[PDB]
Design a protein around this ligand. Structure first.
Ligand code: MG
Ligand code: MG
Ligand code: MG
Ligand code: MG
Ligand code: MG
Ligand code: MG
Ligand code: MG
Ligand code: MG
Ligand code: MG
Ligand code: MG
Ligand code: MG
Ligand code: MG
Length: 158
RNA sequence: AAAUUGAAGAGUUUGAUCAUGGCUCAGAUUGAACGCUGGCGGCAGGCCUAACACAUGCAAGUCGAACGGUAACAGGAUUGC
């Protein structure tokens, strides 16, 4: 029903008196392609087990993002701990031009044409969180017409 | 009416993580050089170094409608007619 993508897999380790204990962590993003996207971070010891955990976490905890026929309403700046994310609406036919982590988020969310850039740290989990944060706070022209006392015509047509 | 439509990251410090941070690569480009190989055509480019030294040929001559003229031949009658 909804598209799901695996972004990154990493092998983490912890130290016990017996020795080193290893595990695999998988970051995935899911979305219906119609303005809903969620990210999940699974953590297990076997790679197939971890990716399933990530999908389960990503399947819930979704967010709703307004899309203007496959592009953003206005340019936005997503910021998380270390990663600075700048996204910008683009014309028809430009495609998804973004980093490896950012491209997966925008594809499953339904964004087709967009210009994006990542500044600072490019750690995949931080980048996707910033992209999620940068899209959830984006407001549609109806929303700004709701906060202010003017109708859609006055907001843009005027 | 148009004169435009525009932005990607990855590797590497750790037992593992985040950040900082340098290093390195994926691109475009050249008056190119070298290695291997090599069919045709169009188009352009071709001493970036010693403003180092130069054999030899050529690259600035025209004007008898300025003038005295006749040295070569071209003619007419030794003769510039
Ligand atoms: Mg690592
Ligand atoms: Mg950095
Ligand atoms: Mg780092
Ligand atoms: Mg990492
Ligand atoms: Mg680095
Ligand atoms: Mg080392
Ligand atoms: Mg050669
Ligand atoms: Mg041929
Ligand atoms: Mg020279
Ligand atoms: Mg000289
Ligand atoms: Mg000549
Ligand atoms: Mg003579």
């Amino acid at each position: 029903e909804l598209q799901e993508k695996l972004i990154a897999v990493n092998r983490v380790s912890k130290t016990v008196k017996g020795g080193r204990i290893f595990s695999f962590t998988a970051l995935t993003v899911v979305g219906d392609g119609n303005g809903r996207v969620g990210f999940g971070y699974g953590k297990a010891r076997e790679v197939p087990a971890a990716i399933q955990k990530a999908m389960e976490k990503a399947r819930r905890n979704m967010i709703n993002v307004a899309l203007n026929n496959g592009t953003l309403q206005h340019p936005v700046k997503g910021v998380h701990t270390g990663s600075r994310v700048f996204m910008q609406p683009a014309s028809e036919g430009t495609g998804i031009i973004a980093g490896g982590a950012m491209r997966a988020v925008l594809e499953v969310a339904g964004v087709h044409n967009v210009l994006a850039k990542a500044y600072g740290s490019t750690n995949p989990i931080n980048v996707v969180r910033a992209t999620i944060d940068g899209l959830e706070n984006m407001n549609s022209p109806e929303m700004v017409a709701a906060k202010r006392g003017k109708s859609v015509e006055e907001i843009l047509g005027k």
